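For reproducibility, we list the full input for the A1L1H complex.
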Amino acid sequence: MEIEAVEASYRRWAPIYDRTFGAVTQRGRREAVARINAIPPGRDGVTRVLEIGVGTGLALPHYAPHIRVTGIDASEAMLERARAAHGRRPTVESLRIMDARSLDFADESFDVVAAMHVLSVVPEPRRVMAEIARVLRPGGQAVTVTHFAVEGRGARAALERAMAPLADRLGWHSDFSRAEVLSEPRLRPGEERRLPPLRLMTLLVLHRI
Ligand SMILES: CCCCCCCC/C=C\CCCCCCCC(=O)OC[C@H](COP(=O)(O)OCCN(C)C)OC(=O)CCCCCCC/C=C\CCCCCCCC
Ligand SMILES: Nc1ncnc2c1ncn2[C@@H]1O[C@H](CSCC[C@H](N)C(=O)O)[C@@H](O)[C@H]1O
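The corresponding predicted structure, in tokenized form, follows.
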């Protein structure tokens, strides 16, 4: 989505987000955070995490004490909820407005990127995936959770196709495909699980080569 359309959509979402979309995606969110928590600590016994599209910060309270998490988002409305609820937590290093297409962080500066329900929203996902590879240290990981549209005939595929023109009203691309997370050759796809709701979501871990 164009960035201004992201802002407009998530201004509307923010007051209901946690009790609606956020609530039905909590299991996958917890699972993603559990994976991140389990990764062997980086330097000084800390795991430095970049939360791309941190939103209202529903993942934040689940990060273990050894995590240092930096969250970025495009939406003030969403981010202010993350601030209000979680801004004082010791694991939370900062919460900033930043566009994932252009990350103001050094090459190889993070151990982990978290990208939950965001890659199907961003403008120019090709640019985002390149930035993810750039900021990840060798052997680092991106833990992603996204809906991918299904291939072929049938009712799900048809509804995904019908919702594609509605992106700016909905807040995401319903036709988002797996290929759009795999455009960057420095990121090798590993663990893949289908998660609720209704088997719509894919957890996909990407390893920095
Ligand atoms: C309100 C939209 C209507 C959804 C249609 C119903 C589909 C369920 C039925 C059958 C399954 C097969 C058809 C699938 C068809 C495709 C569904 C789809 O686009 O999926 C992906 C989508 C987003 O995921 P992302 O890209 O990872 O995230 C990025 C964006 N995020 C951060 C918001 O996820 C969902 O659609 C989860 C389910 C909807 C659950 C949302 C909870 C309801 C939301 C708000 C409450 C208001 C409801 C009123 C609207 C109902 C009238 C239609
Ligand atoms: N280019 C971009 N840069 C930063 N944040 C972006 C972005 N495009 C979309 N987003 C953010 O992506 C979020 C999607 S909602 C998902 C929020 C959170 N990860 C969760 O699991 O609940 C929104 O808050 C939106 O503002």
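The longest strand covers residues 136-147. The chain has one domain: 3-208. Both points were considered when choosing residues for closer inspection.
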